[PDB]
Amino acid sequence: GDDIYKAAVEQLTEEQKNEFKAAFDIFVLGAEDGCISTKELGKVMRMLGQNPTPEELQEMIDEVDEDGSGTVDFDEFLVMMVRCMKDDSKGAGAGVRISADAMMQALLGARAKESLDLRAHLKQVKKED
Ligand SMILES: Cc1cc2c(cc1F)OC[C@@H](NS(=O)(=O)c1cc(C(=O)N3CC(C)(C#N)C3)c(C)[nH]1)[C@H]2O
Ligand SMILES: [Ca+2]
Incomplete structure (x- = not known):
């Protein structure tokens, strides 16, 4: 979609990407x-x-x-x-x-440490276009 999205998605690191990757796994678990x-x-x-x-x-x-x-x-x-x-x-x-x-709350799991905390809930964004 919008470059702003791709720019961020790609910007994500191995750790960040992994956090989301897991959700996808359970989502497409045994898919066609x-x-x-x-x-x-x-x-x-x-x-x-x-x-x-x-x-x-x-x-x-x-x-x-x-x-x-x-x-x-x-x-x-x-x-x-x-x-x-x-x-x-x-x-x-x-x-x-x-x-x-x-959507991930169900994939990754109910419990959570990041979402729990306010600081580890969401970070700023730098998409200067
Ligand atoms: C494949 C995938 C894609 C999406 C998922 C997860 C996924 F597994 O979650 C987020 C969603 N975007 S959204 O803006 O929340 C969003 C909500 C809706 C809607 O009509 N309903 C809310 C509803 C579920 C209820 N009650 C019905 C639409 C069209 N977009 C979409 O990007
Ligand atoms: Ca497709």
């Missing part, structure tokens, strides 16, 4: 093509307590899709986070949007 489809997408979101749809879920991935095959990979997933923090990609309205920290 190791990708995130509407099936796994909603199946994971609902876990948090959501009730999306097969027609709406497609809009999410489609918006965060690169090739437009109807799925999201790791490299693409990261872009969803960088943009999520900004909240520019999409907007709530369908009952309850999804946050990078939320």
Whole structure:
């Protein structure tokens, strides 16, 4: 998507990228093509307590899709986070949007030390374009 996203995604280090990589693993755990489809997408979101749809879920991935095959990979997933923090990609309205920290809350795990702390919740951004 927007260069601002890619710039940040690539800027991420091995540690930062790993934090998100894990979430992707559990997301596409035993997938058909190791990708995130509407099936796994909603199946994971609902876990948090959501009730999306097969027609709406497609809009999410489609918006965060690169090739437009109807799925999201790791490299693409990261872009969803960088943009999520900004909240520019999409907007709530369908009952309850999804946050990078939320969607991952189920993947990585309920407990968390980073999210818990306020300082380790979110850092500034330097995307001078
Ligand atoms: C493949 C993937 C992609 C996305 C994921 C996780 C993923 F697994 O979470 C974040 C999402 N962006 S979003 O702006 O939150 C966002 C919410 C919505 C929406 O219509 N609903 C909120 C809802 C789930 C409820 N109740 C229904 C849309 C279209 N975009 C999107 O980037
Ligand atoms: Ca795809």
